[PDB]
Structure formats: C-alpha cells, structure tokens
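Ticket opened by: R.M.
Priority: normal
Category: complex prediction / small molecule

The reporter submitted a protein together with copper (II) ion and asked that the result be attached to this ticket for the collaborator who will pick it up next week. Submitted input follows.
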Amino acid sequence: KVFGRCELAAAMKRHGLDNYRGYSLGNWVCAAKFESNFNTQATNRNTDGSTDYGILQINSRWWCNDGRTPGSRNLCNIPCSALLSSDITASVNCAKKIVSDGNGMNAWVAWRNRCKGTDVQAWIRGCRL
Ligand SMILES: [Cl-]
Ligand SMILES: [Cl-]
Ligand SMILES: [Cl-]
Ligand SMILES: [Cl-]
Ligand SMILES: [Cl-]
Ligand SMILES: [Cl-]
Ligand SMILES: [Cu+2]
Ligand SMILES: [Cu+2]
Ligand SMILES: [Cu+2]
Ligand SMILES: [Cu+2]
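Result attached by the on-call engineer:
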C-alpha cells in the first residue's frame, strides 16, 4: 500500500506514534516519506547483506527475521515480511522498540539527515487526522 501523507499521519496517530518518546507526529511522517515514500512494500538491500523493510525501513540486522542475514538478531520477534503489510501495526510496534533503544530517531539515518531539526509540522499540514 502507498499511503497518502495525511492518511499515514492519521494511522500513525491512531497507533500511538504521535509524541512517542517525545517525537511529534510530523517526525514520523517525515521519516516514512524519506525511508519508503509511504510504500509499505518497500525493500532495500544494504551493504552488509541485511535488508530494510516497510514504511520505516526496519533493518533485518537487528529487528526482524528474513532468514538471510547472517549473525543478525530479531528483536521485534517478527518475520520481516510482517513489516510489508498494508496494516502498519507491526511496523509501529517495532519502531517503538527501536526509538526506545537509546539513540531516539537517529536510528533512522534518513530522519537524522533529512528531518531532524526541520519544520516537521509541515508533514501534518491540512490533515484530517
Ligand atoms: Cl508527500
Ligand atoms: Cl509535528
Ligand atoms: Cl538471518
Ligand atoms: Cl545467523
Ligand atoms: Cl493502517
Ligand atoms: Cl485524531
Ligand atoms: Cu496521542
Ligand atoms: Cu536503512
Ligand atoms: Cu535478523
Ligand atoms: Cu485519527
């Protein structure tokens, strides 16, 4: 599923990401925009052989099991395919664990490089949530 901007904002807020760990809703929408372009089916191979999955490009090196990432963990206790669903629950639950792991949203390199410090409220402008 490719979410609309406002549609995703609404869904993220319904799933409790708004202000989760102090990160406003616009931070999460911004991250999803630059990680996946709001596409729940996005997958991308990394240099280390892991793969990123879903709307928030969660990495198989720590967070999910894809069966092909040697030496990796599965800290969200899910198959990486669960992160590609039209239903964003598994991605949200796993993101909540990631953003609580010590470095906040810096875990998402694209959030650090493209969202951090910007006017992220723009991402929820005009939205019926
Ligand atoms: Cl957009
Ligand atoms: Cl915001
Ligand atoms: Cl593996
Ligand atoms: Cl392994
Ligand atoms: Cl959803
Ligand atoms: Cl609402
Ligand atoms: Cu709330
Ligand atoms: Cu990544
Ligand atoms: Cu893994
Ligand atoms: Cu709502």
